Design a protein around this ligand. Structure first.
Ligand SMILES: [Mn+2]
Ligand SMILES: [Mn+2]
Ligand SMILES: [Mn+2]
Ligand SMILES: [Mn+2]
Ligand SMILES: [Mn+2]
Ligand SMILES: [Mn+2]
Ligand SMILES: [Zn+2]
Ligand SMILES: [Zn+2]
Ligand SMILES: [Zn+2]
Ligand SMILES: [Zn+2]
Lengths: 72, 76
C-alpha cells in the first residue's frame, strides 16, 4: 500500500527469486511471506497461490504478488 | 554409471561458458542457462531442487565441483 511496503515487498520477492527470472515458485511464496514477518497457514497460502497463479504454472510474478498482498 | 570423459568435458565447457571472469564460479541465476546450453530443459521444480543442491552455502555462487557432482547424481 505505501511506498515503504512496496519497496519491502519488492526486496523480499527478489531475495527469493533464486533462478533470477522475475518470478517465484509457489513454494518460495511461503518463505517470502515469512520473510516479511507474516505467518500464513497452508490453507491461506494455497488460496493465495490459486488466485495469483492465473496461468497455473506454479510461478507468480511481482505484479501478481503485489496485488495479492494488497487484498490482505 | 560412472561419468565418461565426454560428459565431464561437456559439463565443464558449459559451466565455463558462463564464467566470463574465469574464476571458476558462476551464479545460481545462471544454473538454468547452463542446463539449457547442454540441451536440457529443467522444469521450475527441477531447477529449484538443483539450485538447492549446488549452493549449499547459499551465497548465490556455484563452483564446478559442486555443479559436476549434482549432474552425476541427476544422471539418467
Ligand atoms: Mn524465479
Ligand atoms: Mn503463473
Ligand atoms: Mn556469467
Ligand atoms: Mn566472479
Ligand atoms: Mn566467475
Ligand atoms: Mn555458493
Ligand atoms: Zn480465493
Ligand atoms: Zn503476471
Ligand atoms: Zn523460475
Ligand atoms: Zn565448492
Amino acid at each position: 500500500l505505501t511506498e515503504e511496503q512496496i519497496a519491502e515487498f519488492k526486496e523480499a520477492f527478489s531475495l527469493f527469486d533464486k533462478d533470477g527470472d522475475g518470478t517465484i515458485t509457489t513454494k518460495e511464496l511461503g518463505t517470502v511471506m515469512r520473510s516479511l514477518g507474516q505467518n500464513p497457514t497452508e490453507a491461506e497460502l494455497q488460496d493465495m497461490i490459486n488466485e495469483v497463479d492465473a496461468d497455473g504454472n506454479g510461478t507468480i510474478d511481482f505484479p501478481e504478488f503485489l496485488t495479492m498482498m494488497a487484498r490482505k
